[PDB]
Design a binder for this molecule. Structure first.
Ligand SMILES: [Fe+3]
Ligand SMILES: [Fe+3]
Ligand SMILES: [Fe+3]
Ligand SMILES: [Fe+3]
Ligand SMILES: [O-]
Ligand SMILES: [O-]
Lengths: 322, 83, 491, 491, 322, 83
């Protein structure tokens, strides 16, 4: 007869008693069990074709994608503890800086800057949301997908901040058109077209490998350095301390997404040819981001320098993974 | 050797029964009972086990062989009680 | 000061824009969105009735998990599982096997909508739905994990859906069809509307009551917590159907519902039916599976469908009829073939049990009762070998479930066969066959367990071979839940 | 970035300063601080060993209450209380009565130190201690409150300490003495050190195990949660004793400990003793009250006292001896006088029970056993009236508990009487009397229940009068826990 | 026999199903049951004398002090939920404003101001702690005591902030003597002697009535307007946004203490002679606070105006209760 | 009327027993037994109930009255078995 085990059979002989994270996160996807017929239906179904092409056939290869582990070791239970605390602080910032009428203290100039450069971010942030939610559904292992799962939540989290803040701003300054104008700005403003091209094109890269690079190694650090780092230094030196703090709160999220992208890239390099593969994808996209960073930061005050710091910061992210 | 699906009278389930191409309806019947009689259906020895194609009620004479029945592999057949 | 949610909500879902650097169809491929030639702008009418924002989510759900986990911790050392009814233990080992990973796979389904739905409100809800199903998968592993030392059967909380044991294929057959292999708009109808709103929500309620009544408070808490999350993402089908109907596609809408329900029904008829009427002890029984289905599932579909401007499905009366029959079929199947499943099935045919059965279903002893009569006699008469099987049953090609129906004094077992491009297919009901026929492209070359046995894909091609192919060995292979205790009452 | 607690901690307790606009003695009156002519600066050496800061407090304790309350909610509808052993139900109704409000009063004791202690570290800990005892009082009301519809007895969770029912006076006699009527430094010794560190902590552990073993998980959780808070404020006596001893006052230190323990011991001997050896069913019994006291209470006092540079109290051997005796006394008292208490006392003298009793305490049947023999015969012989009382017992003037000790074949019941300024006082042990003698000023004119009966303060001056004065009416007046069920076993 | 009840017997016939607050908060003290012998011991014990004199004999009278109810309806369970959230936000402020090195950005002038006017507050805040913890142990009803209970926690809460912030400041500016100097400042600085006299003298008013007035109606609004409101406007316009926000966070606490003091004063006015009683106590103490506010705010920048606003704000508190 | 505390032999507890100032030791004894014998102590009718002051073992002759015993109100007395 079969003996009772100390742990999940797939984890037997680990030496270390497996952690909650290992216990609820691992070797979970099953479409991977039959690369020839991922889903328990006809093999010629459009969705079979889709997974074979974009997951199984990715040029980015590994013998055991299920080995991957999240540096932060995030599970639903832990993700909610983390983010509730971080929401308490941001909702606390919102509550109390209002109480004191922070919005009234801002200059007419900065308010125009807010409408152009800040509240349209709801579109770009939602796009990333979509971006990461696609990574989720095509990555070749549960532990990878889960990282994408939480990132996507954070992505929606930033859109939520941005939505909330937009009403508060429209409330304080009705004649401005906050809440009404952003679509048009997003769609027709030279400052935003850099980014919107980058993202729209990223969003149809279907290969999980390329999607992960396009979104997580290329597009995200560019949105992050331009929209949070740069506009945040500006926010702050411009008398908008809310945004300065808001943005810094959101960048915690970014650094955690970086951590797990980092870890995955590290893992990919265990296998020959993957560094070349990854580098080819960056080299395809990097110019699209350069364009994104230029078109945006240049219409900023001190535009030329914003461009130079963001370029090298977002690049620094990728140098640090090799 | 030829698989068929057995719909045995008074049993709740259709089962897979391997038969021979040379079997008689009688010998098909007896291979089927093995899986039904005294498992889930009471014997009936006032009665005679007959074979009808499930799809259209066609009754096969007791002694006709599978070979000549013109069955589709895996074809479903009622195994019923008559006299 | 804070804002009132009402005031800023809509901006969370004002996220649509006109693509330029790629095309609408590149951005939103039809095979994954299923817009159905309905415009982006017509899709922006989509308005979910139950609303939530991220701060509210992470807050509430933090506190859900605090509780559910704290209960678990508190009760753990008392080891209830050890002295629970074995019928109960089985119910748990079935549940975790069948659901844990399909729940996890559900997040991906949610994820589908989250990326490809053209209705922005939907994309956001599906993000939370994504989170929901993460949790469910996650929690429904952490929980059974406390029991891996007690029996290997609990490994199946993780292993089941990775096997080709017949139930798991039955499981994947439904889920993959409903939720993993269909466009966003389709997923919202077939999963959130038909299955989650249609069945899961009521089932999970029932399951929580039962856990309690049996005095498993850990599980009672576990189930009922999950259930509190359901309507949040479950709502998502309804608005979709509204836009589809009001538009042009009442027919296309209809058909998905028609399919979606039947397939759910059949899964439900083997996973829940059997448990209600046979595994839960007699005095813990509030109402029959048929009573339950009528009270809590049927009236509400009719309710829902009527308000959406839809019709009752063509197969409705047959469905109604089948509540007297189908599940007792699945139960005899499972029990008779009990070493092919990974929990210990409960017979459920003691004398008392047998009268309740006859009260709730008149004619039961003179049909179903017959088979169990022989089963019984054999075990009294020291011939247990005639109550385990020597062959496979015919698997329905649609639902991957045994073809079975009324035995005994009113025999009515039927096979709705179909030849299609030189292959003969076997079907467990009219509706099952009709499912295949309307979309044959989608099921054509799938092979059910019996096909596989017959095509020589299972080696050795005997019973012990099929048992290995299904990854089942002694000690996780199932047997009679109460160890034939109930036999004593006949001698 | 955050700091490491170690780095900034000391500044939380750098709060002393030199008064100017008032005097040190005005600011810190000796009757409330008890500095004992030890300098402010010598008191600043006070260093609590277990440290906590406000953010840490509100965080942790938020999560404690989340759990404890969530359990309660989860289990509530299953109504365990209704099918619990009645011995158990009583234990709960006793516990809540005796403790809920004394716990609440405890916050004020903590509050005393919080204002008047010259050791700043102490003032802060006592603030948290204040919070702790708030919770305990609060939670230990919310909990019984679910049961007010089941019986009036549960009202006593709130009412008890507002009555002059004899136990409650016994209760207030201890608490007021130990914690409400003494200077800050005194409170830290007598309460936190002697009683909380000395008894409560181990008791509460035992009580939680027992709740579990009996399958009351709500209560099990409730008790064990409280217990997690104890060492936080319980530590507070130790450092005080260190400064006192190292200083000049080892004698003054000593004496408080000596008193403090004896008084606790006597409370414990009626509230816990009886429960362990008689209310908890036989197979739920891990170890005797004597075993328990030896293992978990005695060795540790000796341990503690030795490390603080103190002596075992003069009465120690007598104390050791009394573990064989005192509690069986209190139990017979309570049971024989069972309509004077507000729970239903459990007899505990079935044959099986009676052998366990004799195993754990040799000589028990030939002493205590005798009385219960008569008690039994009477109930077999249809004379129950001779097992309820017609008079008051002699109340010890110190501990306000019946004067009682070994009956039967080795009779040794003694009264340590004392005449003091024209009044005769009655005392239940040497130590009890010695308590009065060293500080007579403090007990002089207090009148115990019997004094009151005798001074004509209780009208009508009969038993039904005393019953009204104690606020007890039928339906909260106690009787035999299992309704004399255990009598059947003698016929 | 005695019937089972729908609620605690002391609450029977309320019409409304009693709330959690009523259920765990009410009619709890028992020393009040025997005014002649509060405690179950000899009646001549110093502590009996103490309660008779300072609680029973208070000139501030009411037939049923146990009727009092806390506007905010605070219980331990609720107090911890509230404050954990509010701690998340403040600890979040600490974490993140450090991350960005806010302390380095402050001017040498402001740093000197911080050492003089800010970090010595640990003494005054601890004194209030003591102040409220005394109110607790002498008030004549549990529901009153409980309000004092939580206030005291908040009081220690502010001391905790102030302690923490003092190390961070000593860390950033070692030569200043932060953490070492405050006692001397508190003890010898004209700016602080106003307050230290007020508080030391308040702290020996033993009558619960007078203690409540002295602490809660007189001293607290003065500490609150001077140390939080005034130094907070200053903090903020001086480039110290942490303190500006810190202080505003703490004032939430103050307003809640005000709410329940308010409610109690309201209750006291139901009975004749109590308005006169209360007014007599204010009139004794008010000059001590005037002195406190003058000595402190005058050494502030724009000193004269700080004095005028604080005086009238702290007075406004008491006008609003009549 | 005069309260005393009764320490009855072989009983676990001292009890309050109202006596009369005119009672005999014998009649004190009998008032005490009422509260002890057949409640918690077996009768002994080979035996004679005697009264000794608890504080110092002083044995009172059977027929001496309370009045003459020089007792303190509430004084504790052993009620013992002799012959
Ligand atoms: Fe789910
Ligand atoms: Fe769901
Ligand atoms: Fe406590
Ligand atoms: Fe305590
Ligand atoms: O769900
Ligand atoms: O405690």
């Amino acid at each position: 007869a079969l003996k009772p085990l100390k742990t999940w059979s797939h984890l037997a002989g680990n030496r270390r008693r497996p952690s909650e994270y290992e216990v609820v996160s691992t070797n979970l996807h099953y479409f991977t069990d039959n690369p020839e017929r991922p889903w328990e239906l006809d093999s010629n179904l459009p969705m079979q074709t889709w997974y074979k092409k974009y997951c199984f056939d990715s040029p980015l290869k590994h013998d055991d994608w299920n080995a991957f582990r999240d540096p932060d070791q995030l599970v639903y239970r832990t993700y909610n503890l983390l983010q509730d605390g971080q929401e308490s602080y941001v909702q606390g910032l919102f509550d109390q800086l209002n109480d004191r009428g922070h919005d009234q203290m801002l200059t007419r100039e900065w308010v125009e800057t807010l409408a152009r450069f800040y509240t349209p971010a709801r579109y770009l942030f939602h796009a990333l949301q979509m971006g990461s939610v696609y990574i989720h559904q095509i990555a070749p292992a549960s532990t990878i997908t889960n990282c994408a799962t939480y990132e996507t939540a954070d992505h929606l989290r930033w859109l939520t901040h941005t939505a909330y803040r937009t009403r508060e701003l429209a409330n304080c300054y009705p004649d401005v058109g906050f809440g009404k104008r952003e679509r048009d700005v997003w769609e027709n403003d030279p400052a935003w077209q850099g980014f919107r091209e980058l993202i729209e094109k990223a969003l149809i890269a279907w290969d999980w490998g390329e999607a992960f690079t396009a979104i997580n190694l290329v597009t995200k650090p560019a949105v992050e350095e331009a929209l949070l780092q740069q506009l945040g230094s500006l926010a702050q030196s411009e008398g908008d301390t809310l945004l300065g703090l808001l943005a810094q709160a959101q960048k915690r999220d970014a650094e955690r997404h970086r951590r797990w992208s980092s870890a995955l890239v590290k893992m990919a390099l265990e296998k020959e040819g993957n560094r070349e593969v990854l580098q080819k994808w960056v080299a395809k996209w990097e110019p699209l981001a350069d364009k994104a960073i230029e078109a945006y930061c240049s219409a900023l005050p001190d535009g030329e320098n914003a461009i130079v710091e963001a370029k090298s910061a977002s690049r620094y992210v990728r140098q640090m993974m090799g | 050797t030829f698989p068929i699906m057995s719909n045995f009278e008074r049993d709740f389930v259709i089962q897979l029964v391997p038969v021979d191409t040379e079997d008689t309806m009688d010998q098909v019947a007896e291979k089927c009972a093995y899986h039904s009689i005294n498992r889930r259906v009471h014997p009936q020895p006032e009665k005679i086990l007959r074979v009808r194609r499930h799809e259209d009620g066609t009754l096969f004479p007791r002694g006709m062989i599978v070979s000549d029945a013109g069955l589709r592999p895996t074809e479903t057949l009622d195994i019923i009680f008559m006299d | 000061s804070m804002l009132k949610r009402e005031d800023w909500y809509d901006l969370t879902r004002t996220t649509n824009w006109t693509p330029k650097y790629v095309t609408e169809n590149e951005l939103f491929p039809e095979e994954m969105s299923g817009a159905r030639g309905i415009s982006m702008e017509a899709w922006e009418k989509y308005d979910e009735p139950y609303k939530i924002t991220y701060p509210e989510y992470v807050s509430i759900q933090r506190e859900k998990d605090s509780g559910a986990y704290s209960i678990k911790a508190a009760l753990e050392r008392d080891g209830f599982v050890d002295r629970a009814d074995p019928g109960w233990v089985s119910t748990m080992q079935l549940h975790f096997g069948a659901w844990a990973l399909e729940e996890y796979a559900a997040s991906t389904a949610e994820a589908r909508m989250a990326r490809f739905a053209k209705a922005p409100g939907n994309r956001n809800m599906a993000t939370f739905g994504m989170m929901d199903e993460n949790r469910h998968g996650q929690i429904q592993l952490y929980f059974p994990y406390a029991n891996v030392k007690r029996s290997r059967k609990w490994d199946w909380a993780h292993k089941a859906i990775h096997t080709n044991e017949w139930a798991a294929i039955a499981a994947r057959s439904f889920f993959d069809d409903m939720m993993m292999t269909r466009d966003s708009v389709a997923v919202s109808i077939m999963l959130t509307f038909a299955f989650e709103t249609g069945f899961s929500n009521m089932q999970f309620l029932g399951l929580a009551a039962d856990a309690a009544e049996a005095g498993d408070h850990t599980f009672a808490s576990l189930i009922s917590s999950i259930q509190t999350d359901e309507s949040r993402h479950a709502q998502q089908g309804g608005p979709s159907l509204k836009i589809l109907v009001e538009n042009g596609k009442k027919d296309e809408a209809q058909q998905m519902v028609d399919v979606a329900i039947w397939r759910s029904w059949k899964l439900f008829s083997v996973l829940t039916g059997p448990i209600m009427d046979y595994y839960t002890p007699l005095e813990s029984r509030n109402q029959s599976f048929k009573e339950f289905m009528l009270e809590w599932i049927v009236a509400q579909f009719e309710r829902q469908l009527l308000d959406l401007g839809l019709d009752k499905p063509w197969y409705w009366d047959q469905f109604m009829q089948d509540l007297d029959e189908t599940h007792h079929g699945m139960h005899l199947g499972v029990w008779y073939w009990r070493p092919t499943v990974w929990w210990d099935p409960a017979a459920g045919v003691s004398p008392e049990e047998r009268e309740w059965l006859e009260e709730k279903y008149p004619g039961w002893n003179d049909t179903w009762g017959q088979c169990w009569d022989v089963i019984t006699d054999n075990l009294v008469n020291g011939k247990p070998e005639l109550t385990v099987p020597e062959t496979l049953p015919t698997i329905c090609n649609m639902c991957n479930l045994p073809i079975a129906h009324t035995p005994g004094n009113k025999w009515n077992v039927k096979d709705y066969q179909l030849e299609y491009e030189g292959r003969l297919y076997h079907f467990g009901s009219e509706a099952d066959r009709w499912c295949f026929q309307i979309d044959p492209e989608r099921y054509k070359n799938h092979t059910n367990l019996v096909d596989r046995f017959l095509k020589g894909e299972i080696q050795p091609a005997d019973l012990a071979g099929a048992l290995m192919y299904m990854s089942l060995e002694p000690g996780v292979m199932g047997d009679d839940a109460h160890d034939y205790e109930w036999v004593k009452a006949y001698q």
